[PDB]
Amino acid sequence: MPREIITLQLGQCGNQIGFEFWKQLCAEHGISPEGIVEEFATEGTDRKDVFFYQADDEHYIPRAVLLDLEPRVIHSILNSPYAKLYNPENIYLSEHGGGAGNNWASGFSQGEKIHEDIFDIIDREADGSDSLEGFVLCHSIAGGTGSGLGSYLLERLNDRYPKKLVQTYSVFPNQDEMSDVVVQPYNSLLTLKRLTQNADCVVVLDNTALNRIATDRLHIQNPSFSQINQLVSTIMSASTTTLRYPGYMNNDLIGLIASLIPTPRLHFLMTGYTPLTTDQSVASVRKTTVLDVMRRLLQPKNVMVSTGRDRQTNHCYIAILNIIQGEVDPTQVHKSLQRIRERKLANFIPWGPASIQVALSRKSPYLPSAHRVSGLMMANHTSISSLFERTCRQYDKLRKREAFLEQFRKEDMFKDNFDEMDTSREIVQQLIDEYHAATRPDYISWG
Amino acid sequence: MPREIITLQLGQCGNQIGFEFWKQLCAEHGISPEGIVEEFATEGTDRKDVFFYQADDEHYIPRAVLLDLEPRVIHSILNSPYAKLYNPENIYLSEHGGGAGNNWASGFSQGEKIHEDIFDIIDREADGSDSLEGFVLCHSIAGGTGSGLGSYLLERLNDRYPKKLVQTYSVFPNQDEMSDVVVQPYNSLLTLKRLTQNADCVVVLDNTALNRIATDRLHIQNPSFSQINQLVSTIMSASTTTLRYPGYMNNDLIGLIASLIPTPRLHFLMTGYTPLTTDQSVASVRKTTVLDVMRRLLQPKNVMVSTGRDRQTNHCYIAILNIIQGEVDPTQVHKSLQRIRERKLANFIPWGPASIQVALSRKSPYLPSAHRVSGLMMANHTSISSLFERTCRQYDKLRKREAFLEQFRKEDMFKDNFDEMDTSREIVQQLIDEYHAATRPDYISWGT
Amino acid sequence: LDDTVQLVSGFEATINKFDKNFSAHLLDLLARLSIYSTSDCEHGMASVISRLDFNGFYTERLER
Amino acid sequence: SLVNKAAVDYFFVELHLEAHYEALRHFLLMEDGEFAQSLSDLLFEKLGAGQTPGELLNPLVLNSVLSKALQCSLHGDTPHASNLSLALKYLPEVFAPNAPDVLSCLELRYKVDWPLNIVITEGCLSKYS
């Protein structure tokens, strides 16, 4: 049975990501914005039960629990196309509407106040899942609502499902874009803290990389938080297509992630996608070959992680697995490997066996794919530490500067100091160093 | 011959619930509000005699007895479209018109005053019934009249047919809401007592649960009292379907409750229905799946009994029979069972044989089904004890405070003491404990 | 009506013995049905068994 | 040439050779990813728990595993999936620990009717198994 994933949408960015994810899943499965399968959606080959629950034989409800400390995001969700996708009883909006004041601690305290409702929502979504593996929380670490509520949701998932894995998709603030959330580094630190203590795996999503991709590839001069969240949801959809369209390979999450996560602590993954195309460029179905795909994957414009230019450490990929969906010629894969070897396009860890795993996945029959072949890469790359190290450095810089702490000082967790943010930054730095260490032979003795 | 059911309607709320139940039964059997068989009721496979009696060779009269201590409700019945449905000899109206004053004891004393009329109604319905199985009393536990008179009617049904089975759909008052009827907890205790002593199976209809079902399943933001009474009537219908719709199995009330009631004391049943829809919400034929039906029936928000979410106690069904009608895919049933097991949505009794009996029947052409496929479950479930235990605790809390007893002290039954309220609370507590035991293997020794 | 209690307990014991014999024959039938459902991997027959043995009372007796 | 053309048309339209290949892809190639995942998890749980072939390959256990995998599979209820059968080549006394061939006793057979059994030979079905 599929490993079902419950999606928790927290704050403005988290709710936007959840809405865009539900839109993409509906489009791929031919589900209307109301949760009803469209008459054209005759291909019952999609796995709704991974991310959606059936309310009836016809109505598909996302297995999503919406928790926010600010009413703005919930109101925007209720005005989105996915308003009818989520179970309204699984949507928690703070009655006070006052938000978290861009304070992670306020959002966390509101999540704690709505803990019972949120965990009831999560359990209701889980009961709609035939073989629920655990919960995946999608949120941003930079805001107040999405950060605090995301940490609260992760905590409550850990409390309710302590024997189940808890993975989070935590969006770290953009370091190249000026965040409107001046307290974003503190919020990011608190979210990394919660991922360290209550999540089992944290996928670091650097908003800087999302903005860079929007600028260079999507031609978006100023990527909004909503646009970054929608890009993240599109990436998650493409990576989860093999979960949603069951096939011969990659029928479970653990099979996909096993090659990417060497140690329980070394759980910081980098992603890659190929071919990369802008949403506007759907028109030209480029006959991209596996060699062309691999060449495009090496372009920084398609990598979902903004690694700093470390001049001292030659950060590298330990291993990369590309799951390619669509028409793929094995001979094209072979030519791609040949060209990569001649060009030395990938460096692997020297201390153990590593390779490019290939998973073949079907495309949604209801969603026209602009690409003959598409692929998600999951990779363990030491450069992912540079995103985590940069987030930690920003957290430490904000705590040391007390920047935007007055908004955080309204919440008890951050009222007197940001010591929790600085300790979180140190823990995230140690995590980054361990991820970088996993590129080295001494990773065998790590820990 | 059909297993006839005598309907006992007590007080304003009970009489309204009984009237709506008889209306629903008539609609399912194609009986007009005047007692005439509708021309559309060409499927002679329904048991009209289960819910209606013949008053003469041509007129079918619902087996309904209207009992009130206040004349307003009886006059409203005689002024309703169902005025010709009820036997006029089965309508007892107190000459004093004063009602029970929201006092359970006053309602009981009025039932004693109207004992002769009620037992005459029961005997007339039984003699008009070729194979009378027993009486089903529909009443509310929250008022004064409907509770006391309902208990009186249950007592008289047990007295007249002591060798016949008596199943009841007994609506217990909500114990978590502060009732404006301060004596409601005593009333609730008396109704649970009567269901425990004189019914063989009691389907608990919590008006709180009815409101929850209307909100979550029927999308009714503010369930009206009429909507609550219609939900109670729906619960009674689901619990009585095996008596009212004859098939290969469960063709009698005693046959229906035998599989559900392992011991005489563990007779407190909880009910669930899916899909639940408000009369106004007929428009959208929801493609309800077997998985969705079973999940909502096991969901307390859609269950016509409001059990709290106990995380510590594995409350369970003693027995459940689901009669499912419509298009059912075996693969969908299998996926439903898989999801139910993974979510542990239903606990079954460990102490006795229980199964889902399936009878295949054609549907009534006269009853519009809002669902392409529908199913009723009648179940004996230990979570109904949570309603009965809470009602008993509230009764004890009121009796210890003598709350609202001044209205009862006006009636002879409560003039000197409130011992009837304390005995009712004790009976409801014993019923709750026995129903909880029926979820456990030790139910064999329950009540020892 | 309630020696009457003693008569009732003796009747109950006789009923329980008859129930045991009936349950044994039903368990043998259920065991044969289970064997048939297991040979042909017929999920339909497993659903039929789950209808007949929803609480699992006869499943353990058939296994026994 | 006329006979060959008419035979090709008969095999495609009447004998549904393409439909037989589609069924082989759905069931034998584990195209139902959910069924394959459930089967793999149940197999690895039984092998790691040391269940014997008489315990693991018992018709009740095999039928329950197949039913659960088909119920969890989107394609498990398909008529092509109904042509799948889990059979035992041999009954091991004990599941050898860390043996990769522990589950080699299982065979998936595909039934071919006349005249398709001339083309889909028992050797072909044995190779598929």
Curated annotation (Swiss-Prot), chain A:
Modified sites of kind Phosphoserine: S131
Return one GO MF term: GTP binding
What PROSITE patterns does its record include?
A: TUBULIN
Q: Name one GO biological process term.
A: cytoplasmic microtubule organization
Kindly state which keywords UniProt assigns to this record, in alphabetical order: Cytoplasm, Cytoskeleton, Disease variant, GTP-binding, Lissencephaly, Microtubule, Nucleotide-binding, Phosphoprotein
Processing and modification events after translation: Phosphorylation at Ser-131 by BRSK1 regulates centrosome duplication, possibly by mediating relocation of gamma-tubulin and its associated proteins from the cytoplasm to the centrosome.
Report the principal subcellular site. cytoplasm
Q: Which GO terms describe its cellular component?
A: apical part of cell; cell leading edge; centriole; centrosome; ciliary basal body; condensed nuclear chromosome; cytoplasm; cytoplasmic microtubule
**Record note on what altering L387P does:** In CDCBM4; the chaperonin-dependent folding and hence the yield of monomeric gamma-tubulin is compromised
Which protein family is it in? Belongs to the tubulin family.
Q: How does it assemble?
A: Component of the gamma-tubulin ring complex (gTuRC) consisting of TUBGCP2, TUBGCP3, TUBGCP4, TUBGCP5 and TUBGCP6 and gamma-tubulin TUBG1 or TUBG2. TUBGCP2, TUBGCP3, TUBGCP4, TUBGCP5 and TUBGCP6 assemble in a 5:5:2:1:1 stoichiometry; each is associated with a gamma-tubulin, thereby arranging 14 gamma-tubulins in a helical manner. Gamma-tubulin at the first position is blocked by TUBGCP3 at the last position, allowing 13 protafilaments to grow into a microtubule.
Linked pathology = Cortical dysplasia, complex, with other brain malformations 4: A disorder of aberrant neuronal migration and disturbed axonal guidance. Clinical features include early-onset seizures, microcephaly, spastic tetraplegia, and various malformations of cortical development, such as agyria, posterior or frontal pachygyria, thick cortex, and subcortical band heterotopia and thin corpus callosum in some patients.
Q: What is this protein called?
A: Tubulin gamma-1 chain
Q: State the organism of origin.
A: Homo sapiens (Human)
From Swiss-Prot, chain C:
> In which tissues has expression of this protein been reported?
Ubiquitously expressed.
Location(s) in or outside the cell: Cytoplasm, Cytoskeleton, Microtubule organizing center, Centrosome
The entry's linked illness reads: Cortical dysplasia, complex, with other brain malformations 15: An autosomal recessive disorder characterized by global developmental delay, variably impaired intellectual development, speech delay, facial dysmorphism, microcephaly, and varying degrees of cortical malformations including pachygyria, thin corpus callosum and subcortical band heterotopia. Most patients have generalized seizures.
The UniProt entry's sequence similarity note says: Belongs to the TUBGCP family.
How this chain assembles, per its entry, is: Component of the gamma-tubulin ring complex (gTuRC) consisting of TUBGCP2, TUBGCP3, TUBGCP4, TUBGCP5 and TUBGCP6 and gamma-tubulin TUBG1 or TUBG2. TUBGCP2, TUBGCP3, TUBGCP4, TUBGCP5 and TUBGCP6 assemble in a 5:5:2:1:1 stoichiometry; each is associated with a gamma-tubulin, thereby arranging 14 gamma-tubulins in a helical manner. Gamma-tubulin at the first position is blocked by TUBGCP3 at the last position, allowing 13 protafilaments to grow into a microtubule.
- Record's function text: Component of the gamma-tubulin ring complex (gTuRC) which mediates microtubule nucleation. The gTuRC regulates the minus-end nucleation of alpha-beta tubulin heterodimers that grow into microtubule protafilaments, a critical step in centrosome duplication and spindle formation. Plays a role in neuronal migration.
Name it. Gamma-tubulin complex component 2
**Species annotation:** Homo sapiens (Human)
Taxonomic lineage is:
Eukaryota, Metazoa, Chordata, Craniata, Vertebrata
Span of the entire protein shown here: 771 to 871 of 902
